């Protein structure tokens, strides 16, 4: 009902934070030449359509992606608002939206749903990723409170604490995107509740530069490409 | 349940002599609020009837014409302490259901002072308004313990800016 | 003026057609019928606030008899704090 | 010890059909100083006792004017007596602009009833905490209306409102033929009210500042008296 | 009392809207049984008339309403809630005939009225009406027809629907007639035999004979829904009494 | 474990009934006794008016209200609620007369009056009207008499009684309709109305009263609703007195 | 102003929606299966009386000529969503693109309507779970489930209502990635034969398919460009003929 | 001590069985908890004064000025300062200037007092009624051509009295008793200054000086002015020799 | 209005224990923010919590926020709220010039901010902001430094030095001993040195945690980098060693 606890703390935000603390794990890592996003997906359903095109990971425009921990129903309302804002910026300025302007845009909407008592807050945590000329490769996180922070590597959702410790000891400022592929897969295999990692339990993506000077490219990996980085990395659930 | 009959007696004559404090008016109202706590804890009637007599001696008379009863109410520390002391006795009895017959009688003396538009009458208006407020959940049963003219003497106590 | 003949008519069409309907129901059925219909619409409009959705409401289309009809206004449609401090008064 | 479940909201009914909040709104009239209203065949009169909170304090206003032909007294809530009196003056002006009459005081009664009954029927407010005596004169003669805030009214030859008013009421009732005949000598209709209001003063006294008198009948329009204007009436 | 769950239209832990279940007990506040049947070219509605006080005018007691030229309904529930729902149904038929240029089907009015009941069944500040509405017509698309609508906003077609606090006996006798006859309508070519058949079933089910003033009748043919007067009912009661 | 169903208006109790509309009729059961008698060509209204002080101004405090011109209205219970429902009725009939250029049917004024009262049983933001109305008149179909509840229920009647004395009044109205099955005349209904009202005042013998009566007869008053006064009132008072002093 | 409904319970749960999934769990079962060349959606019709004519209570509904829907839960909630879902398909997509929306865009729009009912004062969430099934030129055949939360899921097969856990276990046991539309119809008729509360025949059972185009059902010839409805609702005689092959 | 609670306490927009509104009544009791403010009206000027609480040296004075200009002929003393006190005062400022530019003359002090009380009846910014309190006690002082030098106690209720002299804040009883025992229609401006300082001395507990006390007056000739610390000091010196002269 | 003052025991009115008191509790839990005036500058300083090892410093927001070319705002309490509170103030100032041919006055940037905070207190089951702020800068065509504090209730006040958030008692105690209102720090360097000494007593570890912005007349706004505040910290720590070794025993 958006009233303070006597400590000056918001009960609804704390309960929304309890909800996302169950909501599946996501890791993001910022290499010297690209960003990696990975998310672990609890497929307890055989008849759920794996090889559906998205669940945890989404495009916001041609150079920005997100991972979702939380309610996917809540996330998709924010994701569409961010997509509309990215194209409305591109229409106005003829230029691609800077990552800080969009990440904090979704952090200002999520704060409003925490102040007015007719609205429940959004049960979603986002690990944003992208490139722009103002900064370069940027990795941000945002949570049900409307707080947002810049990171070199971060986890959200379940098992955050184990994942942050594993990131901290292996992360290097000068590492390449293929080292961040390896690291994010290792971290998730060293954090997972499921017995071993496999291509349908895993959502993956990258924000590389490629060979051509003007390019930045956002491969949100199809299952067969994820099977290749799995067998190359030594996670290798292979015949 | 700790003090004796010589220590509670010292406490009483200290709070009662603070009812006639010649320099402070805030120490005269504070003392009533505490003489109520002394009186509420009495278990027998003979102390209370003698206190009622002490406080009623300056009151309970037609010795004053309305202009004396008015000008004394702006000035006189003695009747101020006696009205505050009798209101302290009345407010010590918030929830006694069959209303003791001395309460209507002593409310009748206070309600003469409640019309007097100064510091002495103020203590009486506060006494009667606090009384009606605590007796607002019993009032259909307590209205029987008063005469018709006594219930009218309880009426006009709120001199608030928004009551016409 | 230089302003299209049809502009002021089509701007106010939705309001005008309901205002005209309520006056017919007052005339044919008495003051109780538009008093009932305006209070149903008040409960539906006033208890249905969500800063990110502006695309009408499902029960308002049932109440307005618009549940199987499209206008050009439904195919061609046209800050959360500014919405909040309009809904509550500033 | 005797909690009432049915007095929280103005919209609740008691199991016996009472509107307790509205009956509590009447008990606010008993919080004011006494005012007395009375009429002959040709004049209506209001006399009102005014309180203060301290001897340094200006006395409270009790009689209000709505138009040359009517006005009112207020023994209840003063800031809420400004809401009704504003609305009555607004209606007097509406009648002179929109109908070119002036608002006959029976019609004024019907409009106050409508406004107070609306407060009494809808959630998210309170009953009015004020009783009004309205006095007026029009084509149907000298008129006196007791508005009670439940949304009701009655035509009366006289009445008293405020604390200790059963005294003044009983004097008007024992001295009615005395004031109903008076007519062309309006000062005895004023002294009739001053005897009546004097019965509610329990050895309090009238003073030049404590008392206000208002009269409205025939040509002489609605007028109010204060200070030495009420010294010849002590 | 479980707080708001029982006093507004919101789900109990079980998933029960107590505002809707209680509104189905309101429909039996009249103590009236009504019966409806389809013939070959007509549909008929027969309703128990209660006038206990000598002081009433029986010409003003009626639970049968003319909704338009071709369509009519009986209501089970309080008369204030039956007159409110009749006035809506009259307005909804009038606006449909204007918008679509043809006469409002009984199926469409039952759906339109049932969609309105779904509002009060979801909005917490709206209560479901305390009435069951039993629409009848001779639709050019579905011939004689019966459609029933309820406080939960659930509506369905019928061939012999009935609402009342003794409705189970009437319904169980109707089901046994339709089981033996196997046609889904009563095969009379004129409405007089249909009404007489509908007064033979309500006598046999309710265990009492009826006077001409203790019975109601409705006659929905093509081009007209209309109500019978007590002498037209007595012609049928006389023909029942001439047969047995 | 609790009964919060009676605190609010848009709520059914477990049995499926609005308890606020059941408490609003208790406000009517405290009201002034009043009746309407329907004749062979009209409607009579009669009321026992309690005079709680001599100050009550005479012949200006009135319980019979003339809705439109061809209809009459007497109500019992919360007086402010009857005034509100009497002013809305006047608006209703004035609208029909400006639009259709004919007086409103009494059956149609009753329906519009019964839909306004039911609308206050829908929403918790308002309470029911704590008043019952008797109203009736002469139109192009002759004489109609209606009685309307806090619930919005209304029916037509041969005679109707409301308020405190309703028991004794209903029993006498039943005697009338039984002795006069075809119906009673206009002059027989005013005399018999006074008898019924005096007999209902036997519940409250110490609370002195006035009788107020009105016509609406096609022959006696050309079909307009009109007040009963003077000799016909005194001829009714003497009938009431000689039959209640039944020695 | 202390105004919302479906607020968070201290364990991180939405509460009212949980009670809305108990209303869904009480409905007559519905189910859906996706095949290699078509899709099937199916349910039982429960009569309030045997005097009721359940040719009037359709439970399986056309959303666009290539998209079908069915429910479990409160049927009144489902009549109101289906007509908004139809209006949405025309106003948002057909009237801008001259072609009907896919079965992922219409499912998103239905789910957006159910999400708005959770995040509101004044309104309870829906008492229905919807199965939406269809075809599109680039996605191909698809089946989705939508719940009172506004969460939507793509499924190979699913069931909802009373018999749903036994139905979902049979659907896991029988589903394979090479089913055809006549096979999926047989599996769906077998699954309802276990979940049926009443009698089992072509009159009590609702069954629809999105399959090949049917140029007969377009009702006008001369335009091959227009292929004709993929959505077809099985006739009561076809259901009885297939129920003779059972 | 013994408990004395009723069931009518804490009622919002509700009457007790006597008619008592307990939210506005409990708001009127806060005239004993504030810092002391005193007003003295005379035929020569309205003397307003407030006791200062000693500040941190870092808090600069203009942050806490409890005597304020509304207009050149009107000023407020407050016993306590809140955002609502500045809201009342800035409404009074905006009301006084909007009056002067619409009516071409200076606002009557009664009419300004009524306009700040109308803000309180609205509860800021539906029928405006006296149900809940707003803000704090103001002593409004001013001078106009029609009703002269006027001191108003404007209360949280939206009602007020004119007073000849009024004290608010923690000296209220002992101050008002000494004011009513001592005030004349013969008070000169000088004697009104020594009288307010004699009253202030007696309540303040501390030794009275130009750092714990503040003075002002409204005069018609000079307008409103807050007094210089040197001027209150030479007045306080004059009080010392007036009592030493006994 | 709190503690041991209780007549005939007690009972509560509408009053003190309220949403705004719990917003004041949220403000006290947010990092320490300080501001001090000088002869012709104003310096605002903040506590960073010590950044985590995987946090990205080059994009991390400067805690002290520029509202306009001559106005600076810092806060303690809820960050999300301060972001929503700075946006309103920034557009309010840009809109000021566009409609008044006048840059926003520091006192109008403080009355507006506290003013909007007061509206979220007043009513509606919309909560007040869990935020308290320092607003500092210069008016145009003036050389007087200004420094205001605002609180969740919408009360505001002017200070020649102030501190808000965690441990602010100990900082205000140090400022009352080291800030003389007759002779304030006469030079920017001394003003910055005073804020670094003031913060060094309360910050978690050292030069990591301090960050400062210096405002000067004529829109000369200037954030100091880590390397510049490291040379201040080092100079102050040199003087501590010098003072200790200048013990005479």
Numbering used by the authors:
A (entry chain C): 10 to 248
B (entry chain O): 1980 to 2143
C (entry chain P): 48 to 125, 137 to 148
D (entry chain F): 1 to 234
E (entry chain A): 9 to 252
F (entry chain G): 4 to 250
G (entry chain B): 5 to 250
H (entry chain E): 1 to 125, 130 to 250
What does the paper say about this structure?
The proteasome is an essential cellular complex responsible for selectively degrading proteins into short peptides. The proteolytic activity occurs within the CP, which adopts a hollow cylindrical shape, with two β-rings sandwiched between two α-rings. The assembly of the CP is assisted by three proteasome-specific assembly chaperone complexes: Pba1/Pba2 (PAC1/PAC2) , Pba3/Pba4 (PAC3/PAC4), and Ump1 (POMP). Blm10 (PA200 or PSME4)-bound mature CP functions in the ATP-independent degradation of short peptides and proteins with intrinsically disordered regions, contributing to spermatogenesis, gene regulation by degrading acetylated histones, and mitochondrial health 21–25.
Blm10:13S, which includes α1-α7, β2/β3/β4, and Ump1, was the most abundant complex and resolved to 2.84 Å resolution. Here, we report the cryo-EM structure of the Blm10:13S assembly intermediate to find mutually exclusive binding of Blm10 and Pba1/Pba2 to the 13S based on overlapping interaction surfaces at the α-ring and common binding of their HbYX motifs to the α5/α6 pocket. Since the smaller opening in Blm10:13S would cause steric hindrance to the entry for an unfolded polypeptide, we refer to this configuration as in a closed state. In Blm10:13S there is a loss in electron density for α2 Met1 to Phe7, α3 Met1 to Phe13, and α4 Met1 to Phe18 resulting in an open gate. An open gate, however, might not enable activity for this complex because the Blm10 dome is closed. In the Blm10:13S structure, Blm10 is 34 Å away from Ump1 and does not have any direct interactions with the features of CP that are indicative of the immature form (Ump1 or propeptides).
